Design a protein around this ligand. Sequence first.
Ligand SMILES: Nc1nc2c(ncn2[C@@H]2O[C@@H]3COP(=O)(O)O[C@@H]4[C@H](O)[C@@H](COP(=O)(O)O[C@H]3[C@H]2O)O[C@H]4n2cnc3c(N)ncnc32)c(=O)[nH]1
Ligand SMILES: Nc1nc2c(ncn2[C@@H]2O[C@@H]3COP(=O)(O)O[C@@H]4[C@H](O)[C@@H](COP(=O)(O)O[C@H]3[C@H]2O)O[C@H]4n2cnc3c(N)ncnc32)c(=O)[nH]1
Ligand SMILES: Nc1nc2c(ncn2[C@@H]2O[C@@H]3COP(=O)(O)O[C@@H]4[C@H](O)[C@@H](COP(=O)(O)O[C@H]3[C@H]2O)O[C@H]4n2cnc3c(N)ncnc32)c(=O)[nH]1
Ligand SMILES: Nc1nc2c(ncn2[C@@H]2O[C@@H]3COP(=O)(O)O[C@@H]4[C@H](O)[C@@H](COP(=O)(O)O[C@H]3[C@H]2O)O[C@H]4n2cnc3c(N)ncnc32)c(=O)[nH]1
Ligand SMILES: [Zn+2]
Ligand SMILES: [Zn+2]
Ligand SMILES: [Zn+2]
Ligand SMILES: [Zn+2]
Lengths: 362, 369, 369, 362
Amino acid sequence: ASGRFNTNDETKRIVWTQTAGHCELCGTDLTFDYRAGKPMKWGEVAAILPASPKAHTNDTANLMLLCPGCHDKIDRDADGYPENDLSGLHQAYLERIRLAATTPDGGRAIPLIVQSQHFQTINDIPVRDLLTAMSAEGLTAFDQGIKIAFAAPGPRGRDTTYWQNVKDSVQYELEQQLKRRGGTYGDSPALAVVGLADIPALMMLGQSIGDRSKRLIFSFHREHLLRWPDQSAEPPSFLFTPPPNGDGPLALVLSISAQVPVRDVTDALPGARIAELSIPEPSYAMVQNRRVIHAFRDALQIRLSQLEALTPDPIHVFAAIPAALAIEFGALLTTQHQHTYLIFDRDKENQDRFTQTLQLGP
Amino acid sequence: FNTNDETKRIVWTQTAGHCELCGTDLTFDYRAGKPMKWGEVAAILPASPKGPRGRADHDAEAHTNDTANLMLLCPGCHDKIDRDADGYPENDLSGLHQAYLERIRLAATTPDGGRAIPLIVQSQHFQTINDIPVRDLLTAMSAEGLTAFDQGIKIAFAAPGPRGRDTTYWQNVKDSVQYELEQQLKRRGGTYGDSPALAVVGLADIPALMMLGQSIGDRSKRLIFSFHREHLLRWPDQSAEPPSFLFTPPPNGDGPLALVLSISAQVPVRDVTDALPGARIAELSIPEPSYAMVQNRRVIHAFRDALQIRLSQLEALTPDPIHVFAAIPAALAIEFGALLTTQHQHTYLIFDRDKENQDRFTQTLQLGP
Amino acid sequence: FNTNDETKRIVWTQTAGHCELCGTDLTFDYRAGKPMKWGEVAAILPASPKGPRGRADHDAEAHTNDTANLMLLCPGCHDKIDRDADGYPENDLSGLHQAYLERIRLAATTPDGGRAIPLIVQSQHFQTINDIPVRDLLTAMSAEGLTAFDQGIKIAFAAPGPRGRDTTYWQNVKDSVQYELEQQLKRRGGTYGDSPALAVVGLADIPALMMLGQSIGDRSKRLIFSFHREHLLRWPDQSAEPPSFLFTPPPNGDGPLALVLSISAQVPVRDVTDALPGARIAELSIPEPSYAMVQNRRVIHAFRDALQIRLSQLEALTPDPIHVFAAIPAALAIEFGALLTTQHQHTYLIFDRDKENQDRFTQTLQLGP
Amino acid sequence: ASGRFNTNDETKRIVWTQTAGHCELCGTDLTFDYRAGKPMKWGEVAAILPASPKAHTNDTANLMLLCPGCHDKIDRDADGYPENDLSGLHQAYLERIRLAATTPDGGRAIPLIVQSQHFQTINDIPVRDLLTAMSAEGLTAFDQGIKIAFAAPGPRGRDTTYWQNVKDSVQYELEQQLKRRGGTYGDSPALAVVGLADIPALMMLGQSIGDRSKRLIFSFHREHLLRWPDQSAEPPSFLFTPPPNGDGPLALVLSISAQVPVRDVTDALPGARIAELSIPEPSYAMVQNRRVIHAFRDALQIRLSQLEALTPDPIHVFAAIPAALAIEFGALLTTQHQHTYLIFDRDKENQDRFTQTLQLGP
DNA sequence: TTGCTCTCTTAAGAGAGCA
DNA sequence: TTGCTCTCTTAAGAGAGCA
Ligand SMILES: Nc1nc2c(ncn2[C@@H]2O[C@@H]3COP(=O)(O)O[C@@H]4[C@H](O)[C@@H](COP(=O)(O)O[C@H]3[C@H]2O)O[C@H]4n2cnc3c(N)ncnc32)c(=O)[nH]1
Ligand SMILES: Nc1nc2c(ncn2[C@@H]2O[C@@H]3COP(=O)(O)O[C@@H]4[C@H](O)[C@@H](COP(=O)(O)O[C@H]3[C@H]2O)O[C@H]4n2cnc3c(N)ncnc32)c(=O)[nH]1
Ligand SMILES: Nc1nc2c(ncn2[C@@H]2O[C@@H]3COP(=O)(O)O[C@@H]4[C@H](O)[C@@H](COP(=O)(O)O[C@H]3[C@H]2O)O[C@H]4n2cnc3c(N)ncnc32)c(=O)[nH]1
Ligand SMILES: Nc1nc2c(ncn2[C@@H]2O[C@@H]3COP(=O)(O)O[C@@H]4[C@H](O)[C@@H](COP(=O)(O)O[C@H]3[C@H]2O)O[C@H]4n2cnc3c(N)ncnc32)c(=O)[nH]1
Ligand SMILES: [Zn+2]
Ligand SMILES: [Zn+2]
Ligand SMILES: [Zn+2]
Ligand SMILES: [Zn+2]
């Protein structure tokens, strides 16, 4: 349409970069020639047009990149300016490109390693291993990682005070690091967390971090370490057997890492009515990727909704589950609603007898 | 063995002139104000096989101008990846490169979808951090073609005090929804015009989110978004078919009418009748209650349609208030509120789980006229 | 013409291995976890006279190892100053260089002064942004030798609602001072030990800051800091002599006893008697009321001593409450509160300016037993 | 004392850098030899000692730099480890060095230029000029500056609605940019602001920004532009003449840029009782540095405390003051306390007649 | 078993005949 | 009046005789 707008080569380079080399009206990639091995004729495969009718109309930011076909459908005056205003559409297009181009700063993250004193001695997880696993997924620490070890219990054992001090220790550290807002919008950083400790302690870590913020669990794997064994693996089916009817105490057995024998459960809890969540082939190596953790939580909560409806009384939990799953179990039970859960764990200093160690509830 | 000028121009173009590893803008110096191209076109596999990530089986000449091997980096990111090859291996750099490039391509091919005011409303009544990232809402908006003129509004309720969610707490929630939000929309009004749509995501007390919905319904157009435990602000599955919303009508009687919503979880009847003796329970539910069920916005719209039907039926049964006991996702709480704006002008008394009374349901806010 | 290794080692040493223009740590890569020296020793005046800031009268060889011409910079800051010489001229770069070096030298020669918990308490009752920077408190602490194990506690009151500073507002202020703060000190307790001192700075409602002082007095040791309109958290003048705190005793009578504090400004009597008819006014003042008068902590201590005297005298005059009308700096409001902890256990009724009643003084909080 | 701890050269370089090359117990600069032209003997002028008695005792971060004199007063075992723990003192010393080394990120800042439509046309202030003035003082923008121009008034004039829309426009922009927290501690950025507009509008900008945050005013100077004329200049004395006694309206004349004639004040305000704040030599060029602005505010508030005490009635303001001073005047009057001020300004389209244009108050 | 001199590597702008 | 080839500049690590 009538005239054409003139641009020097420097202006062309600027407009091509801020648009990512696509037509702003149809989205066609105007670098097709290069992708094909043909030389780029930058000034032939694109037209540059001011977005507004004819004193910043020529400022680079108010200049548009269009393919020739879309440029030909634009009515223009003898100077190459549009007759109708496309400023809104153009500024919107630039905004979508910037949001995508700035997405890497959405990775700002706090590293957090939590261990028992025992696994810290036998199987220390250094910050370096968490950082490289974080980096490969786009999660970017900006300061020193938090590396915590759960305090050893005194004579009173792991009583309510012990567990409340654990939760305060973890949350004090997290909140200080979650004040370190940054990036394009001032968002709090993401949390990148790995745990290796007894299952009740790991559930208390889940109680501490919750599941209502940008948070990514990582997992320590005997063979693959902090790297995910297989990003393309599909989560397994989580099989459920419902509890028999009766008045005995309700028990939830989680047979994920291994098959828990019923006799060990009824030894610790006489009269137990066992409901069980299992997978077809229990294995210590089952946490192939993060989706497995998400799938476990989804299946678990579906069944806890059924079990909590069955009775007002506590649900007694006997879990053989991987560490990353134990954290997600704790984080799931952080709504306002609180059913009473009594967590049993095997005491390795008392011939692996299931022992009640933790209570979650109102 | 140098990268030619056409290829460097392509690298700058397909990355939009930002660092692929940290997102900083490399086309301008914001400190002193001069346009400048201060990035570096960086090689993943080096020319020298002795360099970082060096390999003997790498034909350097066959890849000098291969943009699969060339990243736009700030000088600092570039200096670090060349000093720590084991920490920044080829396969990890290549995957981040391809992922960065694909996000830009998808933004460039997304058609304009209009404008909206981003609105985040979140509570502090959990015993854990609760925080919706702004970037993630803006990104979900952008995936649908929606842009905004600023990063929008973010309201965080004051936390409960030493007495829990008491009368003062709920006064404060009201003031946040009915005064603070309105004052911030007024200020930003003008930039967005006469009737700007609100792109809204909530994660807050269920009675609060119902009050928000009522307040924003009608007054403004609305595009609902949802926070999801696995997918955050991204819709889990745009192809998922909504579930069936099963309704159970109340028994006949003179007892108080209760509307139970069992969507996130099965609400036990014993807990309703303990709070409201003689309750005549009507229930909306899905076949498999689950926290994860908000798969796409069509799920939200199907809930609305199913409940709009049932609410008019229940208000006919009696002129006395309807008592709500709801285990529902946060986005559905907002939609429930929006149904009560001007049409369903019956009094609704909202019950909620009370951590100060052993998880019993107690009465919180009254909605309606 | 290259900088020798000894001089580069000096540059890295005197800058503590951080970028002199942006403060980033250049001794470590936090993303992937490897110690690495990723900075650059940069020349202000270049070797080539054609380069950025180039000059013909610069003997490059006489300055190759002159640390007055050499800055430790990140690669990005370095790349920008070399691309915009007019935006980053020699005289501006040299001044920032010398200022960076002198701050490090002063920190290194500051003797250890102990530990303290940083505590910021601020309101939202102004019609403008109100925000005390954390860095500035930590820096004032460090100038006195005080360090902390974390950046400390920062409490921001909820803003007034649509009814102004009503009963709900003051309940919330109380909960912030008496529950939120105590819960955060409990959590951080253990790291700081049995009796950790609080390095406290307030900028909040005068009655709130008095309530804070009462709550923190005795319970904990205290190092008071002050926000100043010109100097921020830095003491304006450590050599300034405190002013004389002039006291005017109340007239004899049976009327209500009023304590007027005219330190920031002269409180008009008409405004006291309008709020409290029959008031018998005692007044503490300085010769020249001014918002700027908190020149150093000795000024604060002199106010405390002057007022401790007068408060015991006034409580003897009558067992009925003392009515406070105060135009005082925020740090003195905190100290007033601390005097009322366990010693002055008389009832004090705090009046404040009310924007909802045309700037009249109205009653707010009651302090005491 | 007995043994000595051994370090390789790489460890020495790390310890010297994290301590800034000073003795951690006495603060002596151990780079004295270099400053004198003598070669550095790094291993002779300093000793490196673990801070804690004898498994991170040898980690670089737990290693101390001491001068030989202070090292000799440390009792050590045969391995060179201290017998008493200096970990607390050492970690404190490192913390003070880091706080100083990170001080440049305390400069993160939002640029803000505010102008009238008139001065935007006649004397546009580009962002570049503000940025370079910011940069020279250590203030560092991270995104595009805000550049606002006050809306022209409609038929109703600059009424209360006009002025409330100004204040909302300014505060909306500021607060969005003050969400861009960052740096070491998550602080909101500093505001760097320059105004060039009519004095009432500039006072409304001061009402919008306040004086209770990290904020630095800049000033446009006819000769020196946005750069300060003279950083070493001492502020002038601000002379005050008190108002005569009577019942007429109270007027505050500010004769800073120029001497305001009394007849112009009494023409606009019959019966005016004039109090005046002036300097010895009024001049358009008087804003030599930022301390001048601070000094003006301190002197002004001292006198406003006197005048507001004199009468409950409004104070009528007739100001010939520089633009930067007009902003600080507006920001001063943002406490909870509010006396009524009526601002008169010369109407350049009505032969420069002083005209009441703005009211500040409860 | 540094711990000084000189070569090497990687990025960039500059400019020189020509398009 | 780019708009490809080759030289130039600035930083760094590497390593080679020697300390
Ligand atoms: N076989 C079996 N195991 C049972 C039974 N009843 C309970 N369990 C417990 O389940 C866990 C299974 O081992 P895991 O490696 O899959 O998960 C553990 C667990 O989450 C956490 C703490 O260890 P532990 O107390 O031994 O719990 C073990 C078992 O007692 O950390 C995980 N963990 C432990 N070591 C590692 C490691 N090297 N790598 C990764 N994760 C680890 C029952 O009947 N049978
Ligand atoms: N399981 C269960 N929950 C019940 C029962 N009776 C009442 N409830 C309440 O329903 C909500 C279910 O959690 P949700 O995540 O599906 O939805 C909540 C809700 O819309 C809002 C506020 O949370 P809350 O007050 O805890 O209400 C919770 C429960 O108390 O926000 C949603 N929400 C909370 N956490 C998240 C999260 N991490 N991600 C997304 N949305 C969230 C009953 O019997 N059983
Ligand atoms: N001029 C004047 N002020 C009066 C009168 N009657 C009562 N007042 C109140 O005194 C305070 C004086 O301001 P200040 O800055 O010296 O101290 C305040 C005060 O300690 C706290 C809360 O502010 P506010 O409620 O406005 O109380 C203001 C006034 O209403 O914080 C201090 N504070 C406020 N702003 C700042 C700031 N920018 N920098 C530092 N401290 C600040 C009366 O007749 N006249
Ligand atoms: N001579 C004189 N001036 C009087 C009298 N009564 C009132 N005034 C006003 O004072 C201002 C003095 O000029 P300034 O340059 O020192 O400050 C102005 C003012 O702060 C703002 C708007 O300008 P204006 O409306 O002309 O106010 C002028 C006068 O009317 O911006 C400042 N300003 C204007 N132009 C510039 C500039 N080029 N550079 C810097 N600042 C400027 C009275 O009796 N006599
Ligand atoms: Zn097109
Ligand atoms: Zn980068
Ligand atoms: Zn830097
Ligand atoms: Zn010493």
